[PDB]
Structure formats: C-alpha cells, structure tokens
Symmetry: C2
Subunit: 119 residues, 2 copies
C-alpha cells in the first residue's frame, strides 16, 4: 500500500480532490454565509485555475517524495483554464491525496493555511 506502490497520478488526484473540497468547505462553512454565497466562495478556490497558483506557490519547497508525485502528475483541452494549469491542478490534488495517505496530515494544514491567508 506504499505511495507510488499501487497509486497512480489520477488515483492520487481522485482522493486529493475530495480532501481539498472538504477543507475548503469546512473553512467557508463557518462565516454563516448563505447557500448561494457559500457556493461562490468555495467554487473560487476549488477550480483548477486557482489550484494551479497554489501549486506554483509551494512545489519548490515541499518534500522530495511530494515533488516527484507532483512532477509526474503534470503528464482533452481544459474547459476553463490552460492545459498547463489543469495539469498542475492535478499535481496539487495528487500531492494532497498522498500526504493524507502517508498520515502526513500536517503538510496539508500548512497548504490550506496559505489558501486562507489570501481570501
């Protein structure tokens, strides 16, 4: 059940996407925003275009193992973003998914905190 042992890029991203959504939802679900606004704020941080900047914002610092995960992760034209952004976005979800599995659930809080200190 090791990291890259049985988990592929997409499989890691699949898990990371769900993790990311949960965190973004937990954070905005505390300001008493109404359903319509609550969705707008979350949707602005759950999209790939934004997910990309979060990556380019931490990739150069994350642990080696995670740097490799993201790397291969950047390998059907995207609807609302650059092919380059959709890949990094996957790289981000793939990395998150990995940290979670490795119980390294602290490098995540450090990535989430960077998302909150911006909006």
């Amino acid at each position: 059940s090791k990291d890259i042992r049985d988990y592929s890029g997409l499989e890691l991203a699949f898990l990371g996407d769900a993790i990311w959504e949960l965190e973004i939802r937990k954070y905005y679900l505390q300001f008493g925003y109404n359903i319509p606004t609550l969705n707008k704020y979350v949707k602005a941080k759950v999209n790939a275009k934004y997910q990309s900047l979060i990556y380019k914002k931490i990739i150069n610092d994350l642990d080696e193992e995670f740097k490799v995960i993201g790397k291969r992760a950047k390998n059907t034209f995207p609807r609302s973003c650059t092919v380059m952004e959709y890949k990094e976005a996957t790289a981000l979800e793939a990395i998150i998914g990995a940290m979670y599995l490795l119980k390294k659930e602290e490098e995540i809080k450090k990535i989430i905190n960077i998302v909150i200190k911006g909006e």
Copy 2:
C-alpha cells in the same frame, strides 16, 4: 473556532459539509482496489446518491444518540422535485449528510467510521 451544531448551524450547512465528508470516505474505500477511473467512479456514484444515503439513514436513524436523532429530524423537514429519487429520499439524504456533518464538527469521527462500516459491510 466554530459554534454548536445548534448554536448557529442550519441542517443545510451541515449537509453541505457532510456531503464532502461522505464522498471522501467512499472514494477512500474504493480507491484501494485498483479499479480504473471509469469503474472506480461507477462504484463511488453508487453509494454517493440520494437513494442510497436514504437507505443508510433509515437503517441507522433509530440507533443514533439523541443529539443526532434531533439533527436528522429537523433536517428532513424543499420546493425542488428531486430527479433520481423522491422528496422523502432526498430529505433523508440531507438528514444523513447533516448527521455525518455534525459528528465531524464534534470530533466524533469514530461515529462516522461505524456508519461507513455498514456501507461496505453490506457490500461484501
């Protein structure tokens, strides 16, 4: 820090959080078999829809602590005719995601695992 589940939390807010919590757990369990995306997604959607969560709710509701039974109930009682299910099922689907959402906020993540265990136990 947040507030109490009743301090200022609507059943719709919990169900919102609960929904994300439910997906995560479901993808986790299925992401360990080695299925391919199409297949993986197929198994996930199967236990992530309103009809299924509804079976869950109706199978646990009577055994949940008082505090949860309340949340579940107020959450049930939409002016939005559901598509794949009925009004009652959709409501119980929200009530279920409301309870799951609540347990989490109350650090009762161990109570969530017990419900998730009845999701895959009835799957094998």
